[PDB]
Design a protein around this ligand. Structure first.
Ligand SMILES: Nc1ncnc2c1ncn2[C@@H]1O[C@H](COP(=O)(O)OP(=O)(O)O)[C@@H](O)[C@H]1O
Ligand SMILES: Nc1ncnc2c1ncn2[C@@H]1O[C@H](COP(=O)(O)OP(=O)(O)O)[C@@H](O)[C@H]1O
Ligand SMILES: Nc1ncnc2c1ncn2[C@@H]1O[C@H](COP(=O)(O)OP(=O)(O)O)[C@@H](O)[C@H]1O
Ligand SMILES: Nc1ncnc2c1ncn2[C@@H]1O[C@H](COP(=O)(O)OP(=O)(O)O)[C@@H](O)[C@H]1O
Ligand SMILES: Nc1ncnc2c1ncn2[C@@H]1O[C@H](COP(=O)(O)OP(=O)(O)O)[C@@H](O)[C@H]1O
Ligand SMILES: [Ca+2]
Ligand SMILES: [Ca+2]
Ligand SMILES: [Ca+2]
Ligand SMILES: [Ca+2]
Ligand SMILES: [Ca+2]
Lengths: 375, 375, 375, 375, 375
């Protein structure tokens, strides 16, 4: 605060920017990292009072907006708009200057080497920031839950990761990366929706595709066995008159799309489901290591909030794995803010001082300060 | 030939099947031991005229194939496909029956005891083969070059070996084995390629990873000293517009991956570089033995064809070793066929008759005929 | 104790540090002389609460440790770590100061002359120790059992020894030394394990190799005769589903490795089995001496705890030896602590005062005090 | 020669077979009576062109050989190999048939009665030899130097002897025999080498032990006085970087092993040094006999070629002996061939005809012909 | 006894100390006059409970002892140890003080004049002894058998003597002395044993040489005639598997060593056999004296207990001697204690009082008391 650093806590992504102060219970400032642009065109006298629709203000009015997606995988299509997105975070909501407090961000595992410097360059060289540290997505969720060892599969929208963690951080061998996250599932629904009679192609309806999914589509216990169950007119058929002006008879469609996550074969790829890669990464490890990896299967993120997600991991895991320990998927009561809570503690402890990167340190070692101190 | 044995010469592996007749200069039949399977899916009217893509026919069209890898380390994932691979060798290209000529194969050092019998079983018990002998990979390369004593480090894709050889064959004491060969380097590139902005994950691009490496990536003389040299924009930066439709700005990446071979630390293991193990195996031997081991350091295989491979062995070897003899890595003009030439002579000499295994000998002593005669 | 000497009893080695107080029945403090180092690498926030893993704390968690072996034969690879190992013995477990009590250690027969002074130097010159004496490994086991004459073959991990003992101590003539102990057997298993299909190469699995051996591998009565017995599917084949997640079908492997102890030919050496050297050392002695050497064949150490060890010495000994006395291998009910019990008595008797080395005696005769008083 | 006898000259032993023609200056054919056997094992295609390595051909390549020692004291471990050793002497090097020339050999003093007949049996009964005579080792060295009276101490490898000689040959009373020769010193070095940190145990390094000794180890003038001199860092400390790849810091070790020859106490025996037995054998003789025994102390053999051997005999002899004559050890310029020169003359003179044993004489008196004519 | 003299009876030598009380049948205390010293060396904790091994205690354990021979001919190598030998006789076994009883010892014929006084000096001047008398070895054996005239050849270990005895004691003229006794035969066996293949050189095997002789080696009736008999494989060849662990094929060796006694020519001397000197001493005497000398040829001592000793004296004596009387060697049933029995009577009779030397008599005439009273 003015006369002292005092850092904030932020978990930026391509879905929700979880920013807030220190010592809170839930994120105060939240909005999707997306900028809207007028598509209606024409002239203006009484406009919507916005030139570049952003966040909640943008997501609210979709009809007139052409949602520009900055962070599309990890690569940013354009950095020019990112500058205004950050100008909206500090000055507007938080109402605090960036030339005052440090900044705690999240690191999308295996992000281009140029981004690490490019991002920090916008803070330190451009808008003089006292300090900043970009922690590694998943690792934070471990301490928040109160664990110190297990296997964390933190996936959101950008990318997918299988990170087995121990008291000592893992190494490039058991960990994996895959480009089959939420955004891939969102753009896939429209594809399979054509066989029934739906076509949410354009932008204003591209978001609706995401909306119908989260609050209805359930995951099947056994796709192959429930496919024939579709004949039974009782458990599936349920007219859901969308409270707006349309009926969406979702029968065999409810568990046809979610299966794609575990069955990319419906897309046209070689990559096996995320439950096959789970075996691949574990089976390689030494014999005297797996026993505790199954004891605590950590599954965090919004991807793990679909009605009926743990039950599926009761047959798939037990199949190709030892049978000595008890199996159960751990999904904390509040798994969504798993990353936000963990970062709050580190930003509160004074011991963290001997880790972060100080302002002057950047200038004293140029842009290479990053890879010069950390890895 | 029909009325007489007359053996062939084959050096099978997981990269190139070097088969041909006797008295030739170069291998006639060559193809990778890999089978492809359709991944595009759908229906067929005018197909690619293949049910199980194999060898050159397979490697040619990667886009539609899901390259099934039979020989993955030494262990074969599946033997059912191996039967067709051998059905393609004799009948198709060579156009000669296996019930006619013997067979000279190579032995992957320290291969499971069951394989020795299992392989021969497919020849003798299944497709009646007059005779066969499976010689030991490296030893053949020694006579081909015209040497009788030295240290041969024959490595390809399957496994790595350090075989010091003398007039009398070595013994389990100085020789070593390691699972850090080409295939480990091929699957590693994609890992470190993510820090820059590349992700050749799926199969159709898994092979491209191998292609870019061999015809560009050079080996550094001093990694630690050339890492800082990266700042110099002249010796590294060279836009290589891949003749297809993409630019691959390889600067510090050219000598970052090759170093992994000698620096597994970048992976996450304990195993030291293959140049450390070289010391380990030699330093144990008697004092009055090393002087000639350095005089002729044999380095064969495709692994020893990277621009700038001998220069590195001029500082590493001389460091922890006596300084009495002259040091120089011997890489014959044609080191790739080092194994093929050596086997050709043995398959030509009539004196070899008192060594190989005859057809009936297998039936007269059951499957144990192998370990019963040889070791 | 503070106002008086009162010595402890220690039997240090490269396997178990048998330390404890006086007047006990079993060793209180026990741990392997090995230090672990993080190999997982990365960063730390909630570490394993250890910088240099040691003893039980180290052996417990192998996955993250790179077991540094200090005492590797007798020669110590590095003395810098040995200082902390001894700092862990007194202060932590025993909770007694070294500037208070003497110290009773064991002497690895035929240890470098420099070590005798180097070791004592760390006690007397560095951490002022009132007194210390380093007794000779085997001799102690003789009195513990309650014997005064026979032939003791005390072997553990460091080195092998054949020490015939009489009321008057032996002399360099019948005694022998050999570098073919446990550590040689431990590192050998991985070698022969490759013919079947196992490769416990790296460190985290190097220890597992030692674990599977001790609690399963039995010793054959007649290797050459039991090799053919392997055909019989009843006495060997027994699926041992390792309680973890893997099956280890040990058939002819159970008695293939143990035979190497008595048959180094499987390695590639000239040294005959330890049962041949037994003849060599005895056959030289006078004619009127052997009769009592066979009457009591002492065999101590963990090496003599494999199911079926005495039976083998019923044919090998009787073969090339007189046939007048009764033959039987003496392995006391508790042969493991044979050295610990013997040293306890000497450390209890007050008559021992006229033997040990006093603190000041070291300073009054410099470092040469050792060879100046004793030999 | 074919149409006539004409004898050769041979001085066979367990170190060098000094064979050659008559009228030469130095031995033409020389090699150690040792046979080598492959220990590397495995298979063969380009072998070392030898089944039973012998002599120079064997000593050259030690690494692959398991040096079989035929003549081990006097007793021959095995006679079957001795047959080939002699087949190598005549036919190969000399290129002359044994059924043509006699044979002059040496007699190891006090050799089993059976050997005299057994050896001759292989020549006369097996490979019809015209004649042969086996003269007594030392006596020959007397005439070669040109002396007719004195005390000869001819020792090599087999056994030690103190033979006082006069115009009339000595008698079993002053002469002595002892089993403390070179071979005992060679196998002793490895014993005392363990206190420093060396262990040349196996065969390939057993010979190296003999090599380091002869060309470095010097003999002390006063061991007890030079033991304290070790403190002086100038006369002893001299880094001898063995031209191969190892440093052997020999300080107090140079004169510690040689002393064992004169001080068997370091081994564990009762036998006094060879300089004590010298007194024992002389002090018994009559009073009017010693005066000339000291005047000419003959010391021949390779044992008397260590830098500083005569000086030691200047204090030890003068101590317990009369002081009337001048004392000086006589070691001819060429003392190594002392036995070869003496035998050459006897094999040249025609007067020798009335001494040797003729072919038919053996058959006319059976195998007992030896003890029937000579003693 | 305390209040009165009462003498003991002792026959000390270098083989057996025959001591005991008066009125007994056999000697109670018996042991060889030899002291042992540790040769094994090293350190001690549980020693053999002896600093100076003596007598039975010493002879029992030879392996660790360096048998010190005090009385070596007659001359004592060292008197310092003799003091303890006598301290062991009275105090330990007999449990009686020397300041209480006289002492009856034996006199080695022709012993140095200084010894007579030196010995008595240790008794009278040092350990106040009431009285003592040193009788002449052989003369005692005469009365024991019950004879009063003949020729006694009493030989043991020290020296040889030919003592013709009559009612009146002999005189220096017919009597003789020779240094060719048992000890000379014991040290000779090892010499001739080398021609066959034995070498019992060191101390621990020096005694074994004496052991094998007494209980096997027989004496030939006619050496020259039995030498050829060796060819006959029936009367000689008899495998005597020494009950310990070795075979000693004694054929012509059984009667080769014993002959040396009568044929010193095999050694290298001029002295004729003890049967030639027998003639020499008798042929000189008057003509009218020999007739009774042959009638009773007394032969006592352990030397006359070899199977077949009298038969030899049936041809040798009758050869060069008158043929009027009957010839027969007299060897009493118990000839070993011939000296002990004779001395017992003299020590029992009260008439002996007027002969022995009283305590005070020594002080009243100084050390010369011996030659002053007796001769
Ligand atoms: N209750 C829910 N059920 C299923 N998906 C949800 C739920 N709430 C949010 N999501 C989804 O989670 C994703 C955002 O998760 P988040 O962890 O913020 O991603 P990122 O950090 O990669 O931007 C969006 O795809 C959103 O639709
Ligand atoms: N010119 C080259 N430079 C570098 N690597 C090469 C070259 N040519 C071939 N290779 C590589 O060598 C390997 C095949 O070598 P090979 O000896 O046939 O192996 P294997 O016998 O183990 O199947 C492949 O990894 C291939 O990419
Ligand atoms: N029950 C057992 N059976 C076989 N080996 C055993 C047993 N218990 C311990 N060992 C082995 O004994 C060795 C340790 O013995 P120890 O006498 O302490 O050796 P050192 O003193 O040389 O360190 C280790 O190799 C260990 O695996
Ligand atoms: N220059 C030398 N100095 C010391 N020892 C030597 C020398 N040359 C040879 N020897 C030794 O002499 C011995 C051979 O001597 P030799 O008289 O031939 O013996 P033998 O006749 O008993 O076989 C070997 O031990 C050898 O190492
Ligand atoms: N039964 C026996 N046969 C042959 N020699 C024997 C026998 N018993 C003892 N001796 C020998 O007799 C000698 C001892 O005789 P002894 O009369 O006591 O001698 P001394 O009095 O000279 O000491 C020893 O050499 C011993 O080996
Ligand atoms: Ca996420
Ligand atoms: Ca290869
Ligand atoms: Ca031990
Ligand atoms: Ca010699
Ligand atoms: Ca006697």
């Amino acid at each position: 605060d003015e006369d002292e650093t005092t850092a904030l806590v932020c978990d930026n992504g391509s879905g929700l920017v979880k920013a807030g102060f220190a010592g809170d219970d839930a994120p105060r400032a939240v909005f999707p990292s997306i900028v809207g642009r007028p598509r209606h065109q024409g002239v203006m006298v009484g406009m919507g009072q916005k030139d570049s629709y952003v966040g909640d203000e943008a997501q609210s009015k979709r009809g007139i907006l052409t949602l520009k997606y900055p962070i599309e995988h990890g690569i940013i299509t354009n950095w020019d708009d990112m500058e205004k997105i950050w100008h909206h975070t500090f000055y507007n909501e938080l109402r605090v200057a960036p030339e005052e407090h440090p900044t705690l961000l999240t690191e999308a595992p295996l992000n281009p080497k140029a981004n690490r410097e490019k991002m920090t360059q916008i803070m330190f060289e451009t808008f003089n920031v006292p300090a900043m540290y970009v922690a590694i997505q998943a690792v934070l969720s471990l301490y928040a839950s109160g664990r110190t060892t297990g296997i964390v599969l933190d996936s959101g929208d950008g990318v997918t990761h299988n990170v087995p963690i121990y008291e000592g951080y893992a190494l490039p061998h058991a960990i994996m990366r895959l480009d089959l996250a939420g955004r891939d599932l969102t753009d896939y629904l429209m594809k399979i929706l054509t066989e029934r009679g739906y076509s949410f192609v354009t932008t204003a309806e591209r978001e609706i595709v995401r909306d119908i999914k989260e609050k209805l589509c359930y995951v099947a216990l056994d796709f192959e066995n429930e496919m024939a169950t579709a004949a039974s007119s009782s458990s599936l058929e349920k007219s859901y008159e969308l409270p707006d002006g349309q009926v969406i008879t979702i029968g065999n469609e409810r568990f046809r799309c979610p299966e794609t996550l575990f069955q990319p074969s419906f897309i046209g790829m070689e990559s096996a489901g995320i439950h096959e890669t789970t075996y691949n990464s574990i089976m390689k490890c030494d014999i005297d290591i797996r026993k505790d990896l199954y004891a605590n299967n950590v599954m965090s993120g919004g991807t793990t909030m679909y009605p009926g997600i743990a039950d599926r991991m009761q047959k798939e895991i037990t199949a190709l794995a030892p049978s000595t320990m008890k199996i159960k998927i751990i999904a904390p009561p509040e798994r969504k803010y798993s990353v936000w809570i963990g970062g709050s503690i580190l930003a509160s402890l004074s011991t963290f001082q001997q880790m972060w990167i100080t302002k002057q340190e950047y200038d004293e070692a140029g842009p290479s300060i990053v890879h010069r101190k950390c890895f």
